[PDB]
Amino acid sequence: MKGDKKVIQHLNKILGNELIAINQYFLHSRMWNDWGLKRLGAHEYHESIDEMKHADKLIERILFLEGLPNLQDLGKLLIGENTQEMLQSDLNLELCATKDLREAIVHCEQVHDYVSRDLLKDILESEEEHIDYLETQLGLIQKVGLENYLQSHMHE
Amino acid sequence: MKGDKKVIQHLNKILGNELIAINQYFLHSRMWNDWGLKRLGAHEYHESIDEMKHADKLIERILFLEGLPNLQDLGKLLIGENTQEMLQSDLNLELCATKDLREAIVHCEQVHDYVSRDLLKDILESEEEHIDYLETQLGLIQKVGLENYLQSHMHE
Amino acid sequence: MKGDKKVIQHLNKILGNELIAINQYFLHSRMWNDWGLKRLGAHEYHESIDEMKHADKLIERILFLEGLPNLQDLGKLLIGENTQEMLQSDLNLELCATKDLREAIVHCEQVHDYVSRDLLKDILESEEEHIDYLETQLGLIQKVGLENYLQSHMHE
Amino acid sequence: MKGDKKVIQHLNKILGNELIAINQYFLHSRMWNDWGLKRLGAHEYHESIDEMKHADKLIERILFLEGLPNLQDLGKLLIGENTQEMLQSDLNLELCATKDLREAIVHCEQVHDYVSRDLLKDILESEEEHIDYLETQLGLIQKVGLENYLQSHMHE
Amino acid sequence: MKGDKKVIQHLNKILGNELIAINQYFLHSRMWNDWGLKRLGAHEYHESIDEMKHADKLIERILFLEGLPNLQDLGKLLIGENTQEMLQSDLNLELCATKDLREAIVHCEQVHDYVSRDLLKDILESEEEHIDYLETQLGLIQKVGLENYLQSHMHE
Amino acid sequence: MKGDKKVIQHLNKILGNELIAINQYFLHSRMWNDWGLKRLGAHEYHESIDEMKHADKLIERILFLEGLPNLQDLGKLLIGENTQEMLQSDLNLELCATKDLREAIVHCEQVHDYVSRDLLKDILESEEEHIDYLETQLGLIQKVGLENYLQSHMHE
Amino acid sequence: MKGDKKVIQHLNKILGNELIAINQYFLHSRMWNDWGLKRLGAHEYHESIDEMKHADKLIERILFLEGLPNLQDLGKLLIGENTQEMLQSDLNLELCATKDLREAIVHCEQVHDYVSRDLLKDILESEEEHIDYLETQLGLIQKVGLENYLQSHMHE
């Protein structure tokens, strides 16, 4: 089925965001694991897997619409040097991603691509859960202190 | 994540409706049970539990959006004195609730809060099922007669 | 069997205290969950459920005695802004509520409503366990430190 | 142990009431069964078994207190001729029984026989459940009509 | 079905004997239990249950024959003060009961109420088993001595 | 938040009685076991465990009320030299315990400490069971003779 | 056939030490439980049970040797006011106990009561495990800090 070219362009923009998030989260996960903060590593890995699944659904939708998925362009990773920086960088990336998702949903509604809208809404629900996770961890660092927070995320 | 203040105000309005419905339905349930109309009591209890779960989701969403859930303000319960009045009072309350849900959905769409919209749509689907249940019971009272209808709802 | 009018007034007063506690504890529970303090959130949810069950038993007893349960009047919630304030606010509520239970039991005894007395005694046993829980947590904060206490109530 | 002679007199009065209820409810049960109203018959049999178990506990307590259980004196049975009369006669009997139970509890409290008081309170809780059952059935006859009420209690 | 009025009178006489035996044996059972003679108490309870089941069948038959079961008139209980007296009092009661059963069977045969006769014969077989039990226990007291007999019926 | 000072004194008095009974019954148990009267020894051990559990509940209650449990003061043990004396000494001790329990319950009721009252009533129910056990054993010695009574309590 | 009088005196001295430890550790256990330090409370309860089992074995041995177990004389409990004092007071008590055990073993060896010696050696092995437990906890307080130590012993 021949999709709207601007919808396909929006879907490729979302896909591009997923690709940044996959790599940033995977590396953050393996950094936490390397440091012996295995619970943080495992949860960051789970976030990376979520983004892999979002990318998959986007690729499948673009192909159905007769578009060309762009897996070539990888935007800027902002890798942190410590736990607080890593969490904040992830959170900043998620906030950029939801902004793009909302603009893509607007466009899908405008051209009556309600199935793409619903896919993007499902991804946006997941991203807001990611934002909730990351905001909550930064808040816990303040409430229990950094050393305790890290201690609680050492052992799986 | 910092939510739109008018969306949060709409969510608290919906929450307020849930709180009325929880108490009205719980008391109606226990009145039917007290009268020995246990099947009616059990179904009304189920409705009250549905509204408890709606309230829960609304509270969680308001907190995520950095709003303050209002569990203090309880609107007017209209407790019936017999089965027909109790069902009709519930139905009137549901019809008020769906009106508020539609206005809240309009606002979420306007400001691109698509995750809150989808939550409210899910609640609205449940409320229309509640309306269907209550309308159907009032119709059955007409078709089988009040005495038979009550008889059929005595024993679980 | 018509119950004593002042006994029914007392039961409605106890019921009113339960309705305050249901909402305050439910909101405190969801606040703790929102902050990622899930062990605190779960325990507070089970306190809320306990009060819901108290309210149910009182409603059933009032109806049996041919009184009108009052679910319309909701007294003042006191929502804390951090863990210490939330625990202290719950403790304030419980201490005020047990004072009313004792006065209600006195009245039941005076008019020989021994079944209502035993119901209120069972609720009072639960409220003193709730007081014990709350006082103990506040004491643990003093013994292990606030940051450690919150750490220990982060993960379920 | 040597019980208070007036307490033993109260316990024998309660036992006397149980013996009336056992026989009245057993006969009402078998009359309902005879008429093909088997659900009514089964519930009335259950009430009769409850009173047998009350009598057993009272006999045991009287003997422990070195009293003589009185199973010789059987008071007045009032056997109804139709369902409404039978239920109302049972209800009248239960209301007489609770009046005697409250006077007995007063006396146990006066002489500090707290264990006998707790037994009598357990019996009283059961009789108030019996009263609730009987009142509820009389109310259902009004709400669903006598013919429907009987129909619903034909088949087990 | 319309029973013979003299047969119904006989059945009510048998029922009257059952009602005496129920109460006498239940009290003897609880006296033996009170004394710590639990095997004697359990067997006497079993005898009491047998008489309850006899009474039930007689009530059912009387009602089928369109008679009025008489549970109002309770004849003389003869409660013993020690084991030998209790057993002998039960035995005396059983011998009175079989005398009445034989006269009732004669009358059933005379008027061709063969189904009532067979019920009464089944009851009589049970009473002769009861007589055998009681006679045997009195004989064992002579053969093993009273102290040994009681010792053997202390523990269940 | 403290209990009533005189209630705490009563609870410590009850606790003192438990501590006497624990030690007296444990030694009596082990004397019976040493003599080869293992069924008596096992039952007496069970009585001692009951008193340990009573003491535990009292200690927990005193601490909740912010009293100081007194485990220092051990009153007079009266150890018997043979089975009859041991049983009688236990019985005398239980009768002193129930006297103190009734005085403590009066006080709890007076100051509206209804949870302490219910705890003491539960302990009192258990002590009256203990009295029943002891009185019954002494009575069995009379009915079956001492040698037979001891014989029946040799083997478990 | 009697044990040595001075061996029996030593065994009663060891028994006296057990009785102190039972009560001291049981109260310390219930204080820790009351404070919400349930893992400390559970371990201390376990220590108290060990001492109850030691006392049982000593009572059995004394009775076999035809001595009189002394459960009347309770020496001085030293109840701590906080975790460090409670642990230290337990440790001081264990060190007194092992001193008396070694003197008792010397005496058993001197008079060739090798079975009493082996029993006391088994108790001594257990007391040195108790000492190891207590010393290790005090050392952990130093290594992890008091607040962390207490935190780690809050939850079971």
Ligand code: HEM
């Ligand atoms: C009149 C006030 C209320 C009464 C008497 C009441 C009663 C109950 C009862 C009896 C249950 C079942 C508990 C059990 O058996 O475990 C229940 C479930 C529940 N209630 Fe309430 N309730 C009240 C109000 C509320 C409110 C105001 C909220 C939240 C804002 C709430 C949240 C819940 C939740 C989340 C459940 C669990 C439902 C499930 O099974 O998923 N309730 N309620």
Ligand code: HEM
């Ligand atoms: C002093 C009066 C009586 C006492 C204390 C007494 C006591 C009892 C008790 C304790 C049970 C066992 C109930 C249970 O544990 O579920 C029982 C069973 C029963 N009783 Fe009675 N009873 C009395 C008189 C009667 C009478 C007068 C009747 C009928 C006319 C009757 C009919 C029955 C029947 C049919 C059962 C069930 C037996 C079975 O099949 O297991 N009882 N009774």
Ligand code: HEM
């Ligand atoms: C302050 C006084 C005491 C208290 C509060 C106390 C408490 C307890 C409790 C709660 C139990 C567990 C019972 C159960 O749950 O079944 C127990 C077990 C036991 N107690 Fe005590 N106790 C006390 C004194 C004693 C004394 C003085 C002795 C012996 C001289 C003793 C001997 C025993 C024995 C043999 C057990 C069973 C241990 C096992 O499980 O193998 N107790 N105690």
Ligand SMILES: [Fe+2]
């Ligand atoms: Fe590694």
Ligand SMILES: [Fe+2]
């Ligand atoms: Fe997830």
Ligand SMILES: [Fe+2]
């Ligand atoms: Fe994503």
Ligand SMILES: [Fe+2]
């Ligand atoms: Fe295709």
Ligand SMILES: [Fe+2]
């Ligand atoms: Fe666009």
Ligand SMILES: [Fe+2]
């Ligand atoms: Fe979808």
Ligand SMILES: [Fe+2]
């Ligand atoms: Fe994401």
Ligand SMILES: [Fe+2]
């Ligand atoms: Fe590790």
Ligand SMILES: [Fe+2]
């Ligand atoms: Fe592990």
Ligand SMILES: [Fe+2]
């Ligand atoms: Fe009811």
Ligand SMILES: [Fe+2]
């Ligand atoms: Fe549903």
Ligand SMILES: [Fe+2]
């Ligand atoms: Fe709802």
Ligand SMILES: [Fe+2]
């Ligand atoms: Fe948040």
